[PDB]
RNA sequence: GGUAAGUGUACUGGAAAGUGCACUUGCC
């Protein structure tokens, strides 16, 4: 659909990924090759590129004809391509060390990228997937609005769910947006650029699907008091007493609003919710739609 | 109150944009 061909920009992106000399990179959805021409020009060790659409191959291969052995083009679907088997076991560096010599770079349709960052976020929770090499970093691409929420801060206008879901597992710099006018063809949206480094110590240590559930119910009624959406974690019968103990033990003023909660206010609540989940087995599958 | 355009707007973990709401106007 909408492609990025401006060398000034494709360069700026690969610059904002970090030093890439003799590194290994996985570019998702290379497309016409703008991003990957620039990647190739950062003297990398090898660039693996996975692309769903066969017709971008002739052109992508002209780029590899220009840098032989540097570019490995793989005909694959990003949402199912198992990158963990894609590079040498040699590059696995431990989680407390520095990020491995492995980087992800992507400019995919927002249709694909948004779900991807979700399945990749829990991949970081579990330290599997692309993160078997351990705290591998990512440079990807979202509609300016979505880029904003990912990096939004406690109290910001656009502090939403992916604020919490991304920041508790990662350091999340949203380092610049670019105008839709820069794209062939220009969409009626601006485009934003976010970098992720997986956090050594995550800001919350509970199963991903737990704080996925917890953060959801908070941001449910986004400008009301937090307790009014929270309380829906609990079936009608227990709901009053339960919500009390939860806010009590977690130490949260219920007048607080979802956008005002510290990334640690969340750690607080989930620890308490995990406790009362393990004290009541039939509680974590409760959802009000019933 | 029903529809179309406009303008605001809210929400979005379906955002290369979508939908909901409000108001005004034209027509019914
Ligand atoms: C909006 S175009 C952008 C073109 C190019 N990536 C760029 O930055 O200029 C997105 C590209 O991602 C690819 N793509 C979309 N879904 C994909 C998927 N599931 N797996 C691999 N590639 C995908 C498409 O083939 C297309 O080439």
Numbering used by the authors: 35 to 324
Relevant lines from the article:
Mitochondrial transcription factor B1 (TFB1M) is a dimethyltransferase that maintains mitochondrial homeostasis by catalyzing dimethylation of two adjacent adenines located in helix45 (h45) of 12S rRNA. This m62A modification is indispensable for the assembly and maturation of human mitochondrial ribosomes. TFB1M was originally thought to serve as a transcription factor along with TFB2M but has instead been shown to be a dimethyltransferase with the main role of m62A modification of the 3′ end of mitochondrial 12S rRNA. To clarify the mechanism of m62A modification, we determined the crystal structures of a ternary complex of human (hs) TFB1M (hsTFB1M–h45–SAM) and a binary complex (hsTFB1M–h45) both at 3.0 Å resolution.
In this study, we report the first ternary complex structure of human TFB1M, SAM and h45. The structure of the ternary complex (hsTFB1M–h45–SAM) clearly showed how the substrate RNA, h45, interacts with hsTFB1M. In the structure, h45 folded into a hairpin structure capped with a typical four-nucleotide ‘GGAA’ tetraloop and was suspended from hsTFB1M, stretching across its N-terminal and C-terminal domains. As a typical SAM-dependent methyltransferase, hsTFB1M exhibited a conserved negatively-charged SAM-binding pocket surrounded by Glu85, Lys86, Asp111, Val112, Asn141, Leu142 and Val146, whose primary role was establishing hydrogen bonding and hydrophobic interactions. Two hydroxyl groups in the ribose moiety of SAM formed bidentate hydrogen bonds with the carboxyl group of Glu85. In the structure of the hsTFB1M–h45–SAM ternary complex, SAM lay in a conserved acidic pocket immediately adjacent to the m.937A pocket in order to present the SAM methyl group to one of the two N6H atoms in m.937A. Moreover, the active-site pocket, formed by the highly-conserved residues Gln35, Asn36, Asn141, Phe144 and Val225, could only accommodate one nucleotide of h45. Conversely, in our structure, h45 formed a stem loop and presented one adenine into the hsTFB1M active pocket. Based on the location of h45 in the 12S rRNA, we assume that the folding mode of h45 in the hsTFB1M–h45–SAM complex more accurately reflects the true enzymatic state. Thus, the process of m62A modification is possibly the same with m6A, during which the enzyme active center only accommodates one adenine and one SAM methyl group simultaneously.
